[PDB]
Design a protein around this ligand. Structure first.
Ligand SMILES: C[C@@H]1O[C@H](O)[C@@H](O)[C@H](O)[C@@H]1O
Ligand SMILES: C[C@@H]1O[C@H](O)[C@@H](O)[C@H](O)[C@@H]1O
Ligand SMILES: C[C@@H]1O[C@H](O)[C@@H](O)[C@H](O)[C@@H]1O
Ligand SMILES: C[C@@H]1O[C@H](O)[C@@H](O)[C@H](O)[C@@H]1O
Ligand SMILES: C[C@@H]1O[C@H](O)[C@@H](O)[C@H](O)[C@@H]1O
Ligand SMILES: C[C@@H]1O[C@H](O)[C@@H](O)[C@H](O)[C@@H]1O
Lengths: 670, 670
């Protein structure tokens, strides 16, 4: 080691920054244009520097930046991006490249966030848009304090093929790097500070938390109108419809212009849908057809290589952004289109541009690959913010720096177990992930997928190919409908969780904690432990943290710091509520409520510990909250001496939006 | 593209060298110390430069070297190292890292040779010890002459997810690189010139082509003596025994010193074996125990990181080489030890040193990883050459630059089909590979593996764990013995093929050619097409090239430019002989013949085309051949008017070694 003396500047409470060597002029935070939530960070506890006892070794050598952070024997690690099959990361080796998930945890994935969290209550972010390699406690150094005694494999039964390693080591292919370290005291505190450095989560519109149906590629405007009428007639919720590539006059590559045959009058169509409460979310990939109206203008500002024969705009250049985003604005957003699904900004390598490609800005194709999703998210979101309108959409790649964007990750993979593991890991990765529903061999699988999906960032069927609707499997149709309605009833719960994401950096879906690895349970909001069932299973084990827990459906005591064997039936996803936990429920509305609408709330209170819930309220759709037009309404509930429920809600704040109607309290635990 | 003007110097007939940017001072040829066989290269045809019509674009940008070589529509590509599941490489993307094979063709493998060959009759070698990425015809450039017309996926059934790509693109993480281009006119001509640039193949000792048994880790000197006596008593051939880690006083990490309890008198033991015709091949990994006698001396010249708690010598430093190789020389080689099995110089990444490791020479851990196998091969081989004694051994990693080393690659993987595919690909990779035999669930599998194994560079059972011997499966014991004896009978055939490898660069095992991919047939020498059977199969298809072919066993016409369906039985591996093909057979000796021994030959002549075979002859064991003490004896055979065989052999050369005894001729095709 020739560890270079790097000064750790405490830049916010519990956030330290170090500059090793000569960092590059482009990086993840710069690509994203991520601004820290200074106010939120200033309210966090000043905590001590996590690496109090030395062991940090950062240096530049041979054109690369070498990092080493110490580990203690007790420590487990989480993060290093959107893994699908692993949650404990100590002992893993990962190569953090943006790619479509390939079926194993190599580090190559949709959001290969270079951030990790320790069970000892700290985190570390490497701010590079390069491909980086991580050895998360596999290296064993001859000069280590903790060098294990060499053993003779010939004779010693305790010989180990993976001897004890006492450090995270990272190699960055650059002449320097910025490193951020986040204090605790708890693992979740580190994640929160990381997310706040990124600007906090996006505050979604309420409509983004409703149900979305993506329809078949072939659908015309009339086909969409019919589908909407079918949802209404069947009494299923719907807030936004996803149009797939058929809305464009050409796709792969794209014109970013409405097809004249299928959408002959886009202005009328979008308005008609909006009038029925239905927003539209449009599929794009960013790859340009010679028939796009801005093709000639943008061509010089595109890369050397194409993706499905489409030009690749260099979105680091104003000269590429202006034509591209102008077309979205004038042709779609100004007609009322609510947002986008940004597809195919991930991989595979055989589709996207090679790293040997060249871009007109001079940015490496590598850094472009690592940030392309960030860039499209960034500049598309800005179009909406400029109009004082929230958006909420989908994206197939993100990275560090992307916490604040109004996009949820999805993919073309489908293993349900792994979809839940990704949901867990999204909480460690500063991104949102939806385990989307598409098809299923069976009603049972359809319902199981639907159940976990309504306990996620976005409630969605993607029927681009399958043409399925929530009711397409008659055997589970009644229960699908109940869960679709439950998603709406729970809107005030999800909205308050997302508000915590924005204001405090609290991921709304996260792993347990926050000894053994748990890859199939997650916290959803602060109060709910979700333990999905998978098709073919009649029962599962649920590991409950210490403290009492209550059945979400019945309110009955479930357990306390123990393992349950649960046989929920097909009609229930196992969900448990913390003692004193509160779930505010609005009515089973088919459409998200408007800013000028009051909604009655039933406060479902579980257990016997006095409960406290902070209900977020604002207009649900603009950026007026940035000017202070929002409120947190404190709800408190307990049972009195008689065992009867007693509840309060703090008074509405003068001058602020108030969508809270009549409030009733229900003690779920009899 | 800012293609830099690189001058292609024709450095040998059909070999051109280009220097792009500022190449690094360490590279594959330098690591290997590979000297071209100038004489052999000077005898090859002057052919035209393969890229006659332009399309080459080489440049340095952003600290990296970008290469592009054009492709034509007709072209298929082979090589890019030791692939196990793919032979056609056009359309593949590979990351060429030394690693233990991981179960799919990622580019990470035991010998990730950065050399490819085209069906148009040329080859390209990238001389870098860095990790390089290859896009072997996947990139589609907007300014390409051959840019496919964009299609609308919405409406056009002929839309392609993988549009036509017209170039091989490569990215090297360095400020320059040397590139070598090899002419044809045939694909095999390019491979030959590449191999000759590397110095040709090693000329193995005859004993290296005999049978080797590796025995269980636990075996003592007495256990080895017994095993040898068992082979003799059962009449099975044996030339060298492999000792596994138990020969060392400690292993993982190693002392490189004979265990006092199991090998109390190594001098006597090695001599005793040698006196019975038995050579010894010793297992090592290069990782140093604190009990190695040279530990203190070598310690400063070892890397920062350990492998199974052993120090990693920096073999680019004389100060590390001297102690390490001195110990091998004085403690083993000078006692009579014939060679080594150099294990665990490949991977996985979780065992070997991270790329974040630092080495005392200042060489990157990356370049060390890419060349470690080359270095151990190089310096171990030199110990033997210094003593005018050939060696032949095993190694688990190699690379470009390694053609000339006396080592055969093996691994811990075991899929039999893939073992044959690797054998095919070894011919494109400038390395030797053996599909070794270890265990098997069934007699059938054991025999099938044994059959393909005796048609490979090294006939070997590796029984380190299984304790198996050739006769361990009673149901196939008779047939195993027949194939073991056949390996010996065929020694003059294999030896002449290996002589062509050394003198002409001709790989002794190679793929077909040299439309559809053939991953399960290979040429073995010039005359034999081998088509292995796999356990569970009663029949297979065999694709015969144009020209007549004859059954190896019966001599009967098999076919001509056609597909056969063959049901060989368990007792035969399908082998076909070209028309006029000749297989010289010596007697079924149990031990390779000595330099002063004449051996009778039966010349097995197949078909009816007049045949010509060049039989190589020399002492079979020293480097005297370098001083001209060798001969090629031309054998010619045909049938006369009566259908009776007529043969000749050229006269022995005055003053040269002559091991040829009585020569008889047999026309196999009645
Ligand atoms: C040997 C190397 O020292 C450097 O300073 C560290 O940053 C690397 O991770 C590694 O431990
Ligand atoms: C599964 C893991 O993927 C990572 O990218 C690799 O670096 C490791 O060697 C391993 O193969
Ligand atoms: C842990 C593994 O054990 C196996 O037996 C060995 O063959 C590998 O090289 C590695 O050491
Ligand atoms: C656009 C780039 O131009 C460079 O000169 C080439 O070497 C790369 O492979 C790529 O085609
Ligand atoms: C199988 C292939 O392995 C290569 O190393 C990768 O670069 C490709 O993207 C692909 O996954
Ligand atoms: C060729 C593949 O087809 C699929 O339908 C798409 O979802 C992928 O992104 C890709 O375009």
């Amino acid at each position: 080691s020739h560890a270079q003396t790097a000064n750790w500047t405490e830049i916010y409470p519990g956030v330290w920054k170090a500059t090793v060597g000569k960092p590059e002029s482009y990086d993840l935070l710069k690509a994203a244009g991520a601004q820290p939530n200074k106010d939120a960070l200033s309210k966090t506890e000043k905590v001590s520097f996590p690496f109090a006892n030395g062991g940090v070794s950062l240096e530049v050598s041979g054109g690369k930046t070498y990092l080493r952070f110490p580990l203690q024997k007790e420590e487990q690690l989480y993060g290093f991006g959107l893994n699908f099959q692993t949650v404990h990361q100590r002992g893993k080796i990962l190569e953090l490249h943006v790619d479509h998930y390939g079926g194993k945890d190599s580090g190559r994935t949709h959001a290969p966030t270079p951030f990790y969290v320790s069970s000892n209550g700290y985190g570390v972010f490497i701010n590079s848009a390069r491909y980086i390699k991580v050895w998360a406690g596999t290296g064993v150094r001859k000069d280590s304090e903790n060098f294990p005694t060499p053993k003779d494999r010939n004779t010693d039964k305790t010989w180990s093929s993976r001897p004890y390693s006492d450090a995270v080591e990272i190699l960055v292919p650059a002449e320097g790097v910025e490193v951020y370290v986040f204090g605790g005291p708890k693992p979740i505190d580190a994640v929160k500070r990381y997310n706040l450095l990124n600007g906090g989560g996006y505050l979604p519109p309420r409509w983004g938390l409703g149900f979305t149906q993506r329809v078949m590629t072939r659908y015309t405007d009339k086909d969409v109108e019919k589908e909407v009428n079918d949802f209404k007639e069947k009494g299923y919720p719907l807030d936004f419809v996803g149009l797939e590539p058929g809305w464009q006059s050409k796709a792969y590559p794209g014109t970013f212009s409405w097809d004249k045959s299928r959408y002959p009058d886009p202005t009328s169509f979008v308005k008609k849908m909006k009038d029925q409460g239905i927003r539209l979310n449009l599929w794009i990939n960013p790859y340009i057809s010679p028939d796009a109206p801005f093709y000639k203008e943008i061509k010089p500002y595109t890369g050397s290589h194409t993706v499905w024969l489409g030009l690749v705009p260099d979105f680091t250049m104003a000269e590429a952004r202006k034509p591209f985003f102008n077309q979205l604005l004038k042709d779609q957003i100004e007609r009322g289109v609510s947002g986008y699904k940004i597809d195919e900004v991930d991989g595979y390598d055989y589709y996207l541009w090679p790293d040997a490609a060249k871009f007109p800005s001079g940015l490496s194709a590598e850094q472009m690959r690592q940030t392309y999703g960030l860039l499209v998210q960034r500049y598309s979101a800005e179009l909406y913010k400029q109009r004082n309108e929230r958006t909420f959409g989908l994206v197939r790649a993100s990275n560090g720096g992307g916490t604040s964007f109004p996009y949820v990750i999805y993919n073309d993979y489908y293993n349900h177990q792994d979809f839940i593991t990704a949901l867990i890991n999204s909480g460690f990765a500063g991104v949102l992930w939806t385990p989307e529903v598409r098809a299923s061999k069976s009603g049972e699988e359809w319902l199981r997928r639907f159940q976990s999906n309504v306990f996620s960032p976005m409630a969605m069927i993607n029927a681009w190919a399958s043409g399925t609707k929530p009711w397409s499997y008659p055997e589970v149709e009644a229960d699908v409908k109940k869960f679709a309605l439950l998603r709406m009833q729970m809107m005030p719960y999800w909205y308050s969780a997302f508000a915590r994401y924005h204001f405090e950096g609290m991921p709304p879906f996260r792993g347990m904690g926050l000894s053994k690895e748990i890859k199939d349970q997650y916290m959803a909001g602060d109060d709910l432990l979700v333990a999905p069932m998978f098709a073919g299973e009649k029962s599962r084990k649920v590991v409950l943290p210490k403290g009492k827990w209550y059945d979400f459906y019945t309110g009955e005591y479930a357990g306390d710091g123990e393992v349950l064997d649960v046989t929920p039936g097909l009609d229930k996803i196992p969900v448990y509520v913390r003692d004193g936990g509160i779930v505010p429920m609005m009515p089973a509305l088919l459409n998200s409520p408007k800013s000028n609408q009051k909604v009655d709330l039933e406060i479902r209170y579980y257990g016997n510990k006095p409960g406290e819930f902070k209900l977020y309220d604002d207009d649900g759709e603009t950026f007026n909250y940035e000017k202070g037009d929002f409120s947190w309404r404190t709800i408190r509930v307990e049972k009195d001496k008689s065992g009867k429920v007693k509840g309060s809600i703090s008074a509405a704040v003068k001058g602020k939006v108030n969508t809270v109607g009549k409030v009733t309290f229900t003690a779920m635990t009899k």
